Design a protein around this ligand. Sequence first.
Ligand code: NCT
Ligand code: NCT
Ligand code: NCT
Ligand code: NCT
Lengths: 400, 400, 400, 400, 400
Amino acid sequence: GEFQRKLYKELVKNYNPLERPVANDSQPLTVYFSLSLLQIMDVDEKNQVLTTNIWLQMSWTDHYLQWNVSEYPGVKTVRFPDGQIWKPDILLYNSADERFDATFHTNVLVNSSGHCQYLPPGIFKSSCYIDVRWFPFDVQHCKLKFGSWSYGGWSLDLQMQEADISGYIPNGEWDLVGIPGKRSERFYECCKEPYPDVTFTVTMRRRTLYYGLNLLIPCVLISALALLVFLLPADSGEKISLGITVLLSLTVFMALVAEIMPATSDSVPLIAQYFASTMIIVGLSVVVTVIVLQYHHHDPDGGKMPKWTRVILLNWCAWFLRMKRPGDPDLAKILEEVRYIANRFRCQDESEAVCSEWKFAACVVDRLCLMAFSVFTIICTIGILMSAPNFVEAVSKDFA
Amino acid sequence: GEFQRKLYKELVKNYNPLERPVANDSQPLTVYFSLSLLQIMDVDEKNQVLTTNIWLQMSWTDHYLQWNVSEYPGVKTVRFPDGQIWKPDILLYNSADERFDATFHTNVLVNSSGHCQYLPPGIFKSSCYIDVRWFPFDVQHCKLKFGSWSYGGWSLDLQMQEADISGYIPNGEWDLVGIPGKRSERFYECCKEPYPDVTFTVTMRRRTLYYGLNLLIPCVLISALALLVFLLPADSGEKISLGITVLLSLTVFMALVAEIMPATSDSVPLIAQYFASTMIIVGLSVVVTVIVLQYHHHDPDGGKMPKWTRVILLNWCAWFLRMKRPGDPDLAKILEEVRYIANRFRCQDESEAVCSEWKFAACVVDRLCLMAFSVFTIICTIGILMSAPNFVEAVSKDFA
Amino acid sequence: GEFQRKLYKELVKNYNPLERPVANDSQPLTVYFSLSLLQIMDVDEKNQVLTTNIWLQMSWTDHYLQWNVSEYPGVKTVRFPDGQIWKPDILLYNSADERFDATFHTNVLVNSSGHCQYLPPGIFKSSCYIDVRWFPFDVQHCKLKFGSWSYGGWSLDLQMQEADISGYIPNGEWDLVGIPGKRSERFYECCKEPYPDVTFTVTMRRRTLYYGLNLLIPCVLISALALLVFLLPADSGEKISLGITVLLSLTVFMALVAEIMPATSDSVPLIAQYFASTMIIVGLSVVVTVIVLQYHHHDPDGGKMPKWTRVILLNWCAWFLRMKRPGDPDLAKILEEVRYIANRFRCQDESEAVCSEWKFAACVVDRLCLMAFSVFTIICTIGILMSAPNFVEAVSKDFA
Amino acid sequence: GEFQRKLYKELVKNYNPLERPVANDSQPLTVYFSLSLLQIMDVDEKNQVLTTNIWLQMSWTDHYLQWNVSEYPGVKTVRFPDGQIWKPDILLYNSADERFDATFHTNVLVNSSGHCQYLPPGIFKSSCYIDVRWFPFDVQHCKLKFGSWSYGGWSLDLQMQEADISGYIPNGEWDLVGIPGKRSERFYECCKEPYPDVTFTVTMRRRTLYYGLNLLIPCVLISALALLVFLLPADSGEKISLGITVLLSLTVFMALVAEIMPATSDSVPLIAQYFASTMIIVGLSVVVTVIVLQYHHHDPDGGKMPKWTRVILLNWCAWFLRMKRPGDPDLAKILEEVRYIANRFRCQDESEAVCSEWKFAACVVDRLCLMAFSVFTIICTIGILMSAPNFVEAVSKDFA
Amino acid sequence: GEFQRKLYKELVKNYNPLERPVANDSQPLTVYFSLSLLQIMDVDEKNQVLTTNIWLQMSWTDHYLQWNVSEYPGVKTVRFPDGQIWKPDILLYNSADERFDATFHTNVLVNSSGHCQYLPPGIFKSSCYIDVRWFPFDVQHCKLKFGSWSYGGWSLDLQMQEADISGYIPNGEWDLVGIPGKRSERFYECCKEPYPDVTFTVTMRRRTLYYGLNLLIPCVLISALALLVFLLPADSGEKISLGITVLLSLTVFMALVAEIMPATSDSVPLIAQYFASTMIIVGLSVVVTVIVLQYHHHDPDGGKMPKWTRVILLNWCAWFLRMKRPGDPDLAKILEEVRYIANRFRCQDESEAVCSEWKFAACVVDRLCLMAFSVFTIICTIGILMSAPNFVEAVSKDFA
Ligand SMILES: CN1CCC[C@H]1c1cccnc1
Ligand SMILES: CN1CCC[C@H]1c1cccnc1
Ligand SMILES: CN1CCC[C@H]1c1cccnc1
Ligand SMILES: CN1CCC[C@H]1c1cccnc1
């Protein structure tokens, strides 16, 4: 259109894109900054990197891009590309992207009264501190720091508008609690001028259904299966095999799965604590299995039972568990020979009785250890899980 | 040519690439937008990222790029590169690429009557919601949202043309069901102007041949082989080894293959449910194996069976399964000694008979458990698989 | 030089880089397109992406870049950079690179008679269909489609010259069979103008030495050592251990190694078929081992051998395999007592006689199944391998 | 503003961005270079790559960008983008990024007296030598070398200001010791001119809580559990199983975990030394277990022990460990026959006694080797861990 | 300064960056090309990609960039950025980066007599053929080809200066042997003009301390521990378990670690050959263990030993190994009964003697095969290691 073309010709006349568009130079320029979050595309615990897809909202009044709509009847808004009009140098301070600016420079809508608008999208990659102490029931606060790079408080009076999450799409792993913001002024060793900034904190809670179903439940079930080593009769040579195979499976599990955790040293993760507790339980189970096998395979001539252990293990533990406690010269020479045979048989029977008593003591120790270990692992797992905060509310929100 | 050079000289005379080419500024500009899908290169279930090779189709009428062919006899079409003529700022709203615009800016052909065409290719990386509840028999709908970034409904009246899949090449993993689309107008908190957009939904079904062959069949086969623990005679100490080895192999299979699923918590995947069912079956098989070994290795002097279990396990289960149920003074002192030997032998024989009865009870329990577990696992696998919709048609298309 | 500088000044005068350099605008411009394959950098079966390092070759006559060498004695060729002269917009249609154009824009040589040359290099990433049905003995045909983007048949008459592989550096994995090319005209729904293109098909054969040494041989050898379960005497209980451990090793092998295959569903790959056959063989070997152990550990009082199985297993299989088939009152009651002990011993002897017959039957079944499984695995492996085409020629080229 | 626009117009009049802004060309230009470390985002031991978020600080006096504020009442500072004013070509010499320069070119603040300021951020990726001889208790010194690329001592007199870590955020894995630096002049084979540079050395210490908890503790515990093979009674048959399973688990652990060490050959890492010691201990334990099983399973008729091993193993080791040491014609023919039976029984008892003495000797060796191996492993692990320097202080800082 | 600004104004007057700066156009331009290798950042055996950080050195005489220093007292050197003065289009022919030109375009210094200098750095990624036949003791020669892209011999007379490695920082993994180069002229099918090039060959040797310590030693030790299967007494059922577990661990080791070799078929790598030999040794050991178990568990009623094997295994091998070779009517009916009992006992003793002889033969076979296998494995490992060239010098340089 003739009017649009003439207005475009007259609008850039004597216009310098480097100049701050203010009628009075001594007065600061007010820029309203906001944010429009859409997706928490990825959060990387190991690298402490937050990746989001957001739209930055900026607005300011331009003193030179004004016209009377009566003289230009058809046009009411005009769009300027990058590098043709002044734009704020608002940057993400704590950006982790290889190129510092991840915004996609788009056009700039302009009022008929000089008011401007700027909505550059972009995949923002910010470095936020990630806490894994209460993993996976942790609540993460990551901060997005936005502020003008080379404009101070006397020049660009940055202002805050509430973040908009109307277009936000739910993430399958993280539940958003809110995105509050704050505006503050900081001094720098470079210069004697304040540099106001707008910081948006992203509070997200991790959904624990997948992790609880894939890590906690299988490991708890395998630990409960490890207790089966104490129900295997000692006569079958499979207790050691079962215990060591369970331990090998679990030690493969921890190293293979719980490696996505960052190599931080701020504190021990809850999952690490619980894996360590399970490893201790399984190792002590193997130790007790070795002790039980040592008691079971005792030589009758190796040594009699000591009085204290004999009396305690055959009276007190039996009472507690209600275990059942088992239990012419030719004739002369031929008689002597058969007497020898029978005496040897009697000695064999006495040795067998001693061995049976040893086996009973071993089985009693085994049952007592099974009960104690089951109680210990139940209480330890319950306490470890309940130690983390927001555990009950997380379960109520996820499983219920 | 002289005519072509003169027309190029006269075409850009007083031409502003920022101006919307409309004869009447108060009227909007009609832009026909379409899409030409070529390949679904990659869909990332874990990353919720879809990657496709597509060509965007845009066409609009330019009021300033017109000429009389009679005055330029040889030329009929001209091409302008990027940044020399006005082009719609149509962008992919839900882009997941590091740079928002993935299009490759190509030349722009022009009619002799001002009509234009624009066919920029590009590797579009859009973020779509990926549902894995019915994996691998899931049907996925992902939306590609296209619309002008800075032009509203009063300026750029975006229209729609049906997507073209004539050049589409098939994927070896996903079967296209179609690419429908819709045009809608929505408001934004920025401005009081509607912004029409065109959204193309991609409906793709996953081909399940590879997954069913490489995950389902091996796991069902190994679960069926785990039932062999109940056909092993208890006299050989290998039931526990077989069971624990099968369980370890299955837990490695799970934690090694079922990891490409995203860590979502919307719902439990079907494959996760079926792996959990298989894990429960194998664990309970190990528990029953320990029970059978406990029954088999019973001390004769430990205690007789309770009459209830004796009668039930020796009558009812035997009848149901048609089990076969097995079964001077020198002479005086020599007499007493052989009497003692024979009495000891008779006691040994009766103890052996009791032990054999215990072994029979253990074997009968084992067989009953084998039958029950086979029925349970068959019905559970069949039900879990048949629960997912479109299962039968997926099989008919893939295997048949 | 003065002459060179003057010629450069006069050559750009009134030159428009957007104009097609033709004396008669109605006459199409002839562009000779060729390719210079240098390397096959990488071919990605999983992602269906081919990566090559090639030099495109273009040649066309320019009407405006001509001069008389008599007037410029010293200069005979001139080079222009990108964006200063007209260049064909020849693009790789089926490109899979994040940016569509992977070429590196270099200078353009010019004759003293207007003839031009343009050889841009680049790492080209094309989406070619990869067939893994006969993996690893497959022959892959991948197509590189080149053609002008915005120029039709009435404007840019593309012509094909034979591809040059003179500087081709052989790859250590793939053997180049040839790079034939073809030129065709195809229509588009946009426009009523043909768009000639040049398509180069890359026929490469996979060298199978590495794959046959690292995958086929170890799996065959592991199956051969899994057949050893049928040579272990049943009295020693490690048959189940050996069989299950070999099955575990093989199921780890297949999952860990045969994962570079794409998740395609066009057809079952040969390596997948062979792995499935090996899995079936090992699982059936475990089943037969369980059956053999069940026959070996049979209670003598459990039941006599059925007549049919007894006669056939002790006559027909023995004949076939030529197996060896094994085999005052005081005195009165002392008589009665010794008679009792001897009768018990005789019954005992009959008991181990029956047990030895059972063990012989189990061993005969074991040897028969060993022979059957050996012959079956041999014929299955040979047939599966020889089913794929070009097997013999591939072996003759690689190993011989 | 009118004053701002006029000043911008007059400031770039006759200004060449290529010219070094100095009043006297013969005098060098003083540029104060500093650094503002913000985060140690990632260090790559395998790739010898350091990644940090830093802000470079540069300052210099410009003789052409000066004005009298009395003539421009409102403006006091002006900002110039890249490419419009002269900037130092200060580059990171040892950069490991695909593009050599990673700085984000930002605007340039300017005084009212010509003084300048330049604060370009960037994700700096540098190649620093990484020493793993004391892993994970190592202290790393990586050098960042900054200096002008094409300006010498006579032209650009680079000066140094102390690095600022006021805005530094702690890293969860590395504890910063300090960031000292030095300025030096070094010559080049190209040119007879010094090129002063500023080199910042980053001294970081690795926090060892995570590594000590996840690698040292599990491996020490597994090694301690490997000694349980010596407490297993020899009558049971799981000693070899336990030993070989522990060795397999440990080698799987080492292969899967100690792979993020770089493949350097400068020296053997401490973790590699300790893993090798553990592997040697476990292998020698398996050898000792084989020897003990050979001693335990000795045929009585195979031959009596040598007198030397007899006396030593039954006297000296027993004393040291205080182990208990176990321990008408018809009548004639009937006597002869029963005498035969009894003599055979006596010979059997003699052989049994010899075998029991063999078992006692085997158990004595087993206990002695258990004690020796426990002492050896404890001293070896303590010595290896204490060999690394700063071990005590690292433990005190992390665990205490 | 005024002089510097005036010289900058006068230097670019009538200047054309496209023009070759030569006084006589017919005469070629002499460009001195060199290289300053700094670091071998990474070499990719699998990808056949060599990554180095180098500085390119170029120098040429410019006819138009000359001035009299008397007229410009202060300035003596000037710097031009990219695109303002003519630069050689020297490119890396065999590049592998996604963009062909990986150099960073820095400033260009100029003499007071027209002599120029150009030092563009960059991370150069070149495709070099990598030979893994003698891995890890291989010596790699990779070629970096540099030459003018669009300038021939008649125009740009390229000259070579020796590569500079003064600034080289030694790599931990690879030892530099030297970087010699050559200059040659090649003809291309495009043009009838020679195109001289400079090719630098990088001769690098791999330091083998890490690989020898982490692959060769563990596998040799594991094979030596697999040889322990022949010292286990056959009475303990653990030979099969030990052998199969070692084979499983080794087959995990190979497929898990020796995967960074490329899938090349030029020749079998030394490490692959050694792994194949170890696998064959372990499999044959398992076969021999199965044979020994078959001999040990022989039914005495199965059949007598063949005379040949009896005599050879009891005489020749025993002599060679010096193995010890073990070794009124009532009275009548009581006589008959006791005679029966004793006759059965004598038959039992004869059977036991036959079984003991079988056990002796099995043990002798076991010891003989142990000796043979130890000798075979030691000779095979020594020979396969010594086969590779530069083995002794690599050992002397690394371990000594
Ligand atoms: C607040 N700004 C952003 C970081 C430093 C500071 C600054 C000061 C002067 C010139 N550039 C940047
Ligand atoms: C519809 N457009 C795209 C997203 C927001 C909106 C918009 C409005 C004004 C200026 N830029 C963008
Ligand atoms: C041949 N070109 C490449 C693909 C389609 C066709 C085309 C048609 C119109 C405008 N641009 C491209
Ligand atoms: C100090 N500069 C940076 C590295 C080399 C040196 C240099 C010398 C001459 C021309 N360019 C660079």
